[PDB]
Every structure is written in C-alpha cells, then in structure tokens.
C-alpha cells in the first residue's frame, strides 16, 4: 500500500538546570528505526529496527552530525522565540518539528511535510505545494519572511522529492518482510456482568500492524458511538498494537450487538458477537 517516513524532533529548555534537552526519532510507517538523545552518555544516532543495522559507518556519522546540528539550531531558536513572544527566560519552553514524506503504492511522492510547533501549538508549516508557508501568528511571520528570503522551501522541496522518497524505498526493501507484511488483529469478545441485569461486552483486537484499525459496536446494524468506550490504540511493546471497544448491554439482548473490525491485514472485515 502507501508508506511514510517521518522524523520527529523535540527540544525542551530547562533554565537554571542545564542546556536544552534534544530528542529525535525516525519512523517508517509505524516502526521506530532510529533515535538520538542529547542526554545519552556519548550521544550518537542509534538503530532501533533490525533492517537499519546494516547501514555502514558513514551512515551513522552523517545522521549524528545532522542531529547535533538540529540540537544546535534549536538551542538558538529557543532563545530567539523568547524575544518574538516577549517571554521571560525563567520558564521552560518547547520546540517541535516533524518532516517527511508519504509515497503511494507505485513509489511516487504523495505528500511532503515540514512543520513546527512552539509550546505545543502550530508555529510554521510548509504547505502541500512545497513552495509556500502557513504561519500561525505574527511571530511565525517573522520566520516566514526569513525563510522566504533564504529560499528554504526550495531546499526542503528538493529533499522531499528526492532523497526522502528514494531512501524510504531503500528501507522498505531492506525491511520488506516486516514493513510490507501486515499482521491482522487477533480478535475475541469478552463478557462481564456489572449487575444482575447488565453486562459489559468488550471487543478485543490484539497483535496487529500497522496501527490503523476500525473497531465499532453496532446494535441492529446501527453504530453505538455514544455508548461505546473506545480506547486509544496502544503499543504492545513488540511493534504490534492493541485496541478494544466496550458497550454496556442490558440482560437478554447481547444478540442484537455486533462488533465490526476493519484492518488492512484481514482477508475480509469481521463481524463478531458474544455467544457463550
């Protein structure tokens, strides 16, 4: 199907308690494959998936230099943004950036991204046409004028059209047996009385990859959105994911309830129910 590569970056200032902490991670689809943490002993970018460990020494050196370069510019930018926003130097502040690319099944670019947040809110984002910016406020418009004068969008566009797609293709081939083979959910329905006359039906999806899934309860074929407790999809810790959906059902009519499961690894969507 389609695939994505994304790099995430977080810098957090800690005034009076050292220089900002910088953490960056890289993903292919829902698989973490690289990390760098500036608080590590001798900080280097490190592998986190078996299919990237084969990259040579020049690879890890280049990645570490780029990570350190981002940590460096983020430290300066945190100081600059205090001025843009008229903020005191005593508080902790956060800069986040994500960039990367989505490719279709044919390996062509579908979308490129490069966007920033300050203290958890949109700051400046590259638009879908890779040749214009959306600034969230007047402070970000200062950065926009600088980046337009420096032709930053042109540099990012060249990367997103070229290296981003080309290296994603490389990773997808090297990791094909795990990155290109979806694991369908293992499913079951459990039953728990809460009274003599009401019971919880919980529809479980376990062990699936990628994380995208649809889990719904229907009553006579009608979605029970309001009455359903739907937990956030959560990592199992082994690169697969979990989710469940629960409804409280009055005694005697469990049979009107069906749980519907959609996942790209399933040969056919599932219609499940509680039966002893």
């Amino acid at each position: 199907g389609s695939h994505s590569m994304r790099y995430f970056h977080t810098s957090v200032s800690r005034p009076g308690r050292g220089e900002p902490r910088f953490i960056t991670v890289g993903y292919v689809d829902d698989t973490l494959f690289v990390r760098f943490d500036s608080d590590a002993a001798s900080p280097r970018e490190e592998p986190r998936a078996p299919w990237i460990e084969q990259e040579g020494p020049e690879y890890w050196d280049r990645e570490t230099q780029i990570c350190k370069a981002k940590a460096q510019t983020d430290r300066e930018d945190l100081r600059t943004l205090l001025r843009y926003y008229n903020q005191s130097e005593a508080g902790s502040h956060t800069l986040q950036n994500m960039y990367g690319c989505d490719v279709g099944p044919d390996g062509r670019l579908l979308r490129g991204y490069h966007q920033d947040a300050y203290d958890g809110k949109d700051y400046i984002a590259l638009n879908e046409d890779l040749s214009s910016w959306t600034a969230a406020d007047t402070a970000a418009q200062i950065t926009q004028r600088k980046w337009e004068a420096a032709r930053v969008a042109e540099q990012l566009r060249a990367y997103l059209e070229g290296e981003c797609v080309e290296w994603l293709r490389r990773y997808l081939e090297n990791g094909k047996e795990t990155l290109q083979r979806a694991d369908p959910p293992k499913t079951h329905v459990t039953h728990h009385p809460i009274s003599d006359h009401e019971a919880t039906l919980r529809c479980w999806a376990l062990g699936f990859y990628p994380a995208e899934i649809t889990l719904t309860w229907q009553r006579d074929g009608e979605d029970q959105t309001q009455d359903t407790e739907l937990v956030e999809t959560r990592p199992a810790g082994d690169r697969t994911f979990q989710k469940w959906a629960a409804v409280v059902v009055p005694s005697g009519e469990e049979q009107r309830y069906t749980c519907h499961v959609q996942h790209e690894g399933l040969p056919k969507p599932l219609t499940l129910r509680w039966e002893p």
Binding site: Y7, G26, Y59, R62, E63, I66, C67, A69, K70, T73, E76, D77, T80, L81, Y99, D116, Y123, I124, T143, K146, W147, A150, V152, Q155, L156, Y159, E163, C164, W167
Partner: peptide
C-alpha cells in the same frame, strides 16, 4: 535518511 540542510535560524 535525514535532511542535511535543515533551516538554521527561526
């Protein structure tokens, strides 16, 4: 692999 010419200066 990462973008090597990330914007300096916000």
């Amino acid at each position: 692999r990462r973008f090597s010419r990330s914007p300096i200066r916000r």
